Ligand binder design. Structure first.
Ligand SMILES: *Sc1ccccc1C(=O)Nc1ccccc1
Ligand SMILES: *Sc1ccccc1C(=O)Nc1ccccc1
Ligand SMILES: [Zn+2]
Ligand SMILES: [Zn+2]
Ligand SMILES: [Zn+2]
Ligand SMILES: [Zn+2]
Lengths: 153, 153
């Protein structure tokens, strides 16, 4: 199995820890952890292309999209590799993350190691927002916290 | 060419930006950037195995050593892949980093993307300290700052 991890930090209250595990080469990736300091509701959750946090989350670039598709939700055929949908924060501002995804990987060209995980201010509309931006970014607003996805033991 | 980047953060503030560039997979990696907030002199400079900064630099694990060798300096045949020697801070506490290394890579099993770059409190003795620890860690003392090495544009 391969494992990865990411510490989410930003300029404000949002912080988190996210773990990734992939038992088989080309098998699904389990994503789990916790994010706090969020407003209650849905928050866009994306792998962005660059693991460049030199200017914070703004240096991370666009959604990780090695297969040149439009933006969608994780259960859509038409999605970016980095489109992990939304995490859900409760009224305490805590998101307990538990995702299984078949498109991201921890090896090869769908590999997300060395890229940036970002949690957003607003909900990702999953390409169903009714404007042009919806099928590019999902209209998820500001980047509240991010980190580089690293190899874990 | 492949490019990578790392933001080093640690108390001081010890803060740095380190860039990596490799023109072909068979080529050396150019490592350049700046680290500030250091004491004047030599500071050990290592790629540690895990890109895990969940508990700060301590979670990064040992020196990246995929070939099961002893610790050395960068110009030694007997070294860890992660053994980048020392950076040098001036009397303003600034290390201007300029290294070319032939052993680290931005691809393959010597790949350092997704691992942790660490700058240390003391000088790396490069395996020439005269105790057992010298040929494992180089006696470079505490981890001052670190970050996960990410893919850059
Ligand atoms: S997982 C990963 C993360 C960042 C850069 C490269 C990789 C990677 O595993 N790439 C591979 C491509 C082709 C064959 C093996 C590995
Ligand atoms: S470059 C990289 C970054 C993060 C995880 C894995 C890799 C990688 O490509 N590793 C390889 C090991 C052995 C053979 C090919 C690739
Ligand atoms: Zn995003
Ligand atoms: Zn997207
Ligand atoms: Zn070290
Ligand atoms: Zn070493």
């Amino acid at each position: 199995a391969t494992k990865a991890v990411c510490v989410l930090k930003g300029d404000g209250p949002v912080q988190g820890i996210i773990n990734f595990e992939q038992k088989e080469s080309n098998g699904p990736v389990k994503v789990w952890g916790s994010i706090k300091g969020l407003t209650e509701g849905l928050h866009g959750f994306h792998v962005h292309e660059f693991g460049d946090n030199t200017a914070g989350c703004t240096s991370a670039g666009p959604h990780f999209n090695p297969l040149s598709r439009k933006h969608g939700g994780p259960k859509d055929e038409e999605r970016h590799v980095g489109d992990l949908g939304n995490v859900t924060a409760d009224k305490d501002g805590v998101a307990d993350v538990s995702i299984e995804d078949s498109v991201i990987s921890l090896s090869g060209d769908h590999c997300i190691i060395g890229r940036t995980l970002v949690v957003h201010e607003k909900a990702d509309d999953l390409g169903k927002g009714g404007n042009e931006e919806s099928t590019k970014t999902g209209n998820a607003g500001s980047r509240l916290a991010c980190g580089v996805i690293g190899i874990a033991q």
